[PDB]
Amino acid sequence: ENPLKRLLVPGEEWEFEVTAFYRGRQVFQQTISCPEGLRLVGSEVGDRTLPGWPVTLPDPGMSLTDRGVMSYVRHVLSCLGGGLALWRAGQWLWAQRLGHCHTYWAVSEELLPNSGHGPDGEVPKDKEGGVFDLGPFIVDLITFTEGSGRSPRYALWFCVGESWPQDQPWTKRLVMVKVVPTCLRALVEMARVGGASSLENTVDLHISNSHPLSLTSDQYKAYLQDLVEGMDFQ
Amino acid sequence: EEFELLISNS
Protein backbone atom coordinates (compact mmCIF):
# COMPACT_ATOMS: atom_id res chain seq x y z
CA GLU A 1 0.00 0.00 0.00
CA ASN A 2 0.89 3.70 0.10
CA PRO A 3 2.70 4.51 3.36
CA LEU A 4 2.21 8.25 2.79
CA LYS A 5 -1.56 7.76 3.12
CA ARG A 6 -0.94 7.36 6.87
CA LEU A 7 -0.74 11.19 6.91
CA LEU A 8 -4.50 11.43 6.37
CA VAL A 9 -5.80 8.51 8.41
CA PRO A 10 -8.56 9.81 10.69
CA GLY A 11 -7.15 9.78 14.22
CA GLU A 12 -3.51 10.09 13.14
CA GLU A 13 -1.38 12.60 15.13
CA TRP A 14 1.06 14.90 13.39
CA GLU A 15 4.03 16.28 15.24
CA PHE A 16 4.12 20.10 15.39
CA GLU A 17 7.28 22.05 16.16
CA VAL A 18 6.42 25.35 17.87
CA THR A 19 9.12 28.05 18.02
CA ALA A 20 8.55 31.42 19.65
CA PHE A 21 10.45 34.65 19.04
CA TYR A 22 10.35 37.83 21.09
CA ARG A 23 11.70 40.77 19.05
CA GLY A 24 13.40 38.36 16.68
CA ARG A 25 15.07 36.32 19.43
CA GLN A 26 14.23 32.62 19.77
CA VAL A 27 12.97 32.10 23.33
CA PHE A 28 11.13 28.78 23.19
CA GLN A 29 10.82 25.62 21.16
CA GLN A 30 8.71 22.54 21.79
CA THR A 31 7.49 19.62 19.71
CA ILE A 32 3.85 18.59 20.31
CA SER A 33 1.78 15.58 19.27
CA CYS A 34 -1.79 15.59 20.59
CA PRO A 35 -5.15 14.44 19.21
CA GLU A 36 -6.53 17.91 20.10
CA GLY A 37 -3.69 19.78 18.40
CA LEU A 38 -2.04 22.61 20.33
CA ARG A 39 -2.98 25.84 22.06
CA LEU A 40 -0.51 28.70 22.57
CA VAL A 41 -0.97 30.33 25.97
CA GLY A 42 0.69 32.99 28.10
CA SER A 43 -0.02 31.11 31.33
CA GLU A 44 -3.00 33.06 32.61
CA VAL A 45 -3.76 29.43 33.46
CA GLY A 46 -6.41 28.93 32.89
CA ASP A 47 -9.47 27.01 31.74
CA ARG A 48 -8.39 23.37 31.46
CA THR A 49 -11.58 22.47 29.60
CA LEU A 50 -10.25 24.49 26.66
CA PRO A 51 -9.10 22.25 23.78
CA GLY A 52 -5.49 21.66 22.73
CA TRP A 53 -2.25 20.77 24.45
CA PRO A 54 -1.26 24.00 26.24
CA VAL A 55 2.04 25.37 24.97
CA THR A 56 3.18 28.02 27.43
CA LEU A 57 5.10 30.94 25.94
CA PRO A 58 7.70 31.90 28.55
CA ASP A 59 7.76 35.08 30.58
CA PRO A 60 10.50 37.36 29.19
CA GLY A 61 12.21 37.57 32.60
CA MET A 62 12.54 40.50 34.99
CA SER A 63 15.98 41.80 34.04
CA LEU A 64 16.62 45.55 33.91
CA THR A 65 18.19 44.60 30.62
CA ASP A 66 15.74 45.23 27.76
CA ARG A 67 13.05 45.93 30.36
CA GLY A 68 11.09 48.28 28.08
CA VAL A 69 10.23 46.10 25.10
CA MET A 70 10.10 43.00 27.30
CA SER A 71 7.38 44.67 29.40
CA TYR A 72 5.44 45.04 26.15
CA VAL A 73 5.96 41.34 25.45
CA ARG A 74 4.79 40.49 28.94
CA HIS A 75 1.67 42.62 28.42
CA VAL A 76 0.81 40.83 25.17
CA LEU A 77 1.35 37.42 26.83
CA SER A 78 -0.86 38.45 29.75
CA CYS A 79 -3.68 39.18 27.31
CA LEU A 80 -3.43 35.88 25.40
CA GLY A 81 -6.22 34.44 27.58
CA GLY A 82 -7.57 31.23 26.03
CA GLY A 83 -4.81 31.67 23.46
CA LEU A 84 -4.26 30.46 19.91
CA ALA A 85 -5.44 26.97 18.95
CA LEU A 86 -4.05 25.03 15.97
CA TRP A 87 -5.16 21.53 14.98
CA ARG A 88 -5.60 19.13 12.08
CA ALA A 89 -8.80 17.71 10.63
CA GLY A 90 -8.60 15.83 7.36
CA GLN A 91 -6.21 17.42 4.89
CA TRP A 92 -6.59 20.78 6.62
CA LEU A 93 -4.93 22.64 9.48
CA TRP A 94 -7.31 24.88 11.41
CA ALA A 95 -6.72 27.78 13.78
CA GLN A 96 -8.85 29.70 16.25
CA ARG A 97 -8.24 32.61 18.59
CA LEU A 98 -9.57 31.89 22.08
CA GLY A 99 -8.31 34.99 23.85
CA HIS A 100 -8.05 38.73 23.32
CA CYS A 101 -4.97 39.12 21.09
CA HIS A 102 -5.74 39.71 17.42
CA THR A 103 -3.49 37.26 15.57
CA TYR A 104 -2.45 37.28 11.90
CA TRP A 105 -0.96 34.34 10.05
CA ALA A 106 0.85 33.35 6.87
CA VAL A 107 2.31 30.19 5.38
CA SER A 108 5.93 31.13 4.77
CA GLU A 109 9.57 30.07 4.59
CA GLU A 110 11.20 28.41 7.61
CA LEU A 111 13.38 31.40 8.38
CA LEU A 112 11.37 34.42 7.20
CA PRO A 113 7.74 35.02 8.13
CA ASN A 114 7.06 37.98 5.89
CA SER A 115 7.47 37.75 2.15
CA GLY A 116 4.78 37.14 1.76
CA HIS A 117 2.56 39.78 0.24
CA GLY A 118 0.96 40.58 3.58
CA PRO A 119 -0.68 38.05 5.88
CA ASP A 120 -2.75 35.19 4.51
CA GLY A 121 -5.42 36.17 7.02
CA GLU A 122 -6.52 36.91 10.58
CA VAL A 123 -7.22 33.95 12.87
CA PRO A 124 -10.95 34.04 13.63
CA LYS A 125 -12.62 34.04 17.00
CA ASP A 126 -15.65 31.88 17.92
CA LYS A 127 -15.22 29.61 14.89
CA GLU A 128 -12.37 27.78 13.22
CA GLY A 129 -10.43 29.08 10.23
CA GLY A 130 -8.54 27.01 7.69
CA VAL A 131 -4.87 27.96 7.58
CA PHE A 132 -3.33 25.14 5.54
CA ASP A 133 -4.45 22.68 2.88
CA LEU A 134 -2.23 19.63 2.30
CA GLY A 135 -3.72 19.14 -1.17
CA PRO A 136 -2.07 22.04 -3.03
CA PHE A 137 1.09 21.46 -0.96
CA ILE A 138 1.46 17.93 -2.34
CA VAL A 139 0.73 19.11 -5.89
CA ASP A 140 3.51 21.69 -5.49
CA LEU A 141 5.81 19.13 -3.89
CA ILE A 142 5.37 16.88 -6.95
CA THR A 143 6.21 19.84 -9.18
CA PHE A 144 9.28 20.46 -7.01
CA THR A 145 10.52 16.89 -7.56
CA GLU A 146 10.23 17.34 -11.32
CA GLY A 147 12.52 20.39 -11.27
CA SER A 148 9.68 22.66 -12.31
CA GLY A 149 8.88 24.73 -9.24
CA ARG A 150 10.04 26.21 -5.97
CA SER A 151 10.33 24.49 -2.60
CA PRO A 152 6.77 24.33 -1.26
CA ARG A 153 6.12 26.32 1.91
CA TYR A 154 4.76 24.72 5.09
CA ALA A 155 5.82 26.98 7.98
CA LEU A 156 2.89 28.64 9.68
CA TRP A 157 3.80 32.00 11.20
CA PHE A 158 1.59 33.84 13.69
CA CYS A 159 1.97 37.49 14.62
CA VAL A 160 0.34 37.94 18.05
CA GLY A 161 -1.28 41.20 19.22
CA GLU A 162 0.14 43.38 16.43
CA SER A 163 -0.53 43.98 12.74
CA TRP A 164 1.27 41.69 10.29
CA PRO A 165 4.74 43.21 9.63
CA GLN A 166 4.34 43.86 5.91
CA ASP A 167 7.38 45.76 4.55
CA GLN A 168 8.84 45.96 8.08
CA PRO A 169 11.57 43.87 9.73
CA TRP A 170 9.73 41.00 11.37
CA THR A 171 12.18 41.12 14.27
CA LYS A 172 10.48 44.34 15.46
CA ARG A 173 7.38 42.35 16.38
CA LEU A 174 6.90 41.50 20.03
CA VAL A 175 5.58 37.97 19.69
CA MET A 176 6.02 35.85 16.55
CA VAL A 177 5.39 32.13 16.63
CA LYS A 178 6.38 29.58 13.97
CA VAL A 179 4.60 26.24 13.80
CA VAL A 180 6.03 23.55 11.54
CA PRO A 181 4.25 20.25 10.93
CA THR A 182 7.47 18.28 10.87
CA CYS A 183 6.11 15.70 8.41
CA LEU A 184 6.05 18.42 5.76
CA ARG A 185 9.60 19.54 6.50
CA ALA A 186 10.63 15.90 6.10
CA LEU A 187 8.73 15.50 2.82
CA VAL A 188 10.49 18.53 1.34
CA GLU A 189 13.91 17.33 2.51
CA MET A 190 13.18 13.90 1.01
CA ALA A 191 12.43 15.56 -2.34
CA ARG A 192 15.76 17.41 -2.26
CA VAL A 193 17.83 14.25 -1.75
CA GLY A 194 15.73 12.27 -4.21
CA GLY A 195 17.47 13.60 -7.29
CA ALA A 196 20.84 12.55 -5.86
CA SER A 197 20.25 9.26 -7.68
CA SER A 198 17.84 6.33 -7.74
CA LEU A 199 19.19 4.79 -4.55
CA GLU A 200 17.17 4.67 -1.33
CA ASN A 201 16.84 7.57 1.08
CA THR A 202 15.17 7.55 4.47
CA VAL A 203 12.24 9.78 5.35
CA ASP A 204 10.83 10.06 8.87
CA LEU A 205 7.25 11.34 8.72
CA HIS A 206 7.20 12.23 12.43
CA ILE A 207 3.58 11.07 12.81
CA SER A 208 2.00 8.72 15.35
CA ASN A 209 2.52 4.95 15.06
CA SER A 210 4.81 5.45 12.07
CA HIS A 211 8.16 4.05 10.99
CA PRO A 212 10.96 5.75 9.01
CA LEU A 213 10.57 4.89 5.32
CA SER A 214 13.41 3.89 3.02
CA LEU A 215 12.42 4.81 -0.53
CA THR A 216 13.93 5.32 -3.97
CA SER A 217 13.18 8.59 -5.74
CA ASP A 218 10.84 6.73 -8.07
CA GLN A 219 9.00 5.06 -5.19
CA TYR A 220 8.63 8.42 -3.44
CA LYS A 221 7.31 10.27 -6.48
CA ALA A 222 4.91 7.38 -7.18
CA TYR A 223 3.52 7.51 -3.64
CA LEU A 224 3.08 11.30 -3.81
CA GLN A 225 1.06 10.95 -7.01
CA ASP A 226 -1.11 8.21 -5.53
CA LEU A 227 -1.54 10.29 -2.37
CA VAL A 228 -2.70 13.33 -4.32
CA GLU A 229 -5.23 11.25 -6.29
CA GLY A 230 -7.20 10.50 -3.12
CA MET A 231 -7.17 14.05 -1.75
CA ASP A 232 -9.88 16.71 -2.07
CA PHE A 233 -9.72 19.55 -4.58
CA GLN A 234 -12.47 21.99 -5.55
CA GLU B 1 9.45 51.89 20.15
CA GLU B 2 5.89 52.64 19.10
CA PHE B 3 3.70 49.57 19.53
CA GLU B 4 0.12 49.53 18.36
CA LEU B 5 -1.30 46.56 20.24
CA LEU B 6 -4.38 44.88 18.82
CA ILE B 7 -6.04 43.47 21.90
CA SER B 8 -9.80 43.51 22.45
CA ASN B 9 -11.61 44.07 25.77
CA SER B 10 -13.74 41.88 28.03
Provide, as residue numbers in chain A, all residues whose Cβ is less than 8 Å from the Cβ of B9. 100
Q: Do B7 and A72 touch (CB under 8 A)?
A: no
Q: Which of A75, A100, A162 comes nearest B4 by C-beta?
A: A162
Phi and psi, residue A175, nearest 5°: -135, 105
Task: Provide the number of structural domains found in chain A.
Answer: 1
In chain A the beta strands, taken as DSSP E runs, fall at: 16-22, 25-32, 38-41, 53-56, 84-89, 92-97, 103-108, 121-122, 129-133, 155-160, 176-181, 200-203, 213-216
Instruction: Write out the residue range of the structural domain in which residue A27 sits.
Output: 1-234
Provide, as residue numbers in chain B, all residues whose Cβ is less than 8 Å from the Cβ of A162. 3-6
Q: How was this structure determined?
A: X-ray
Q: Do B5 and A163 touch (CB under 8 A)?
A: no
- The answer to whether A55 and A40 have CB atoms below 8 angstroms apart is yes
Q: What is the CATH number for A186?
A: 2.60.200.10
Phi and psi, residue A162, nearest 5°: -140, 160
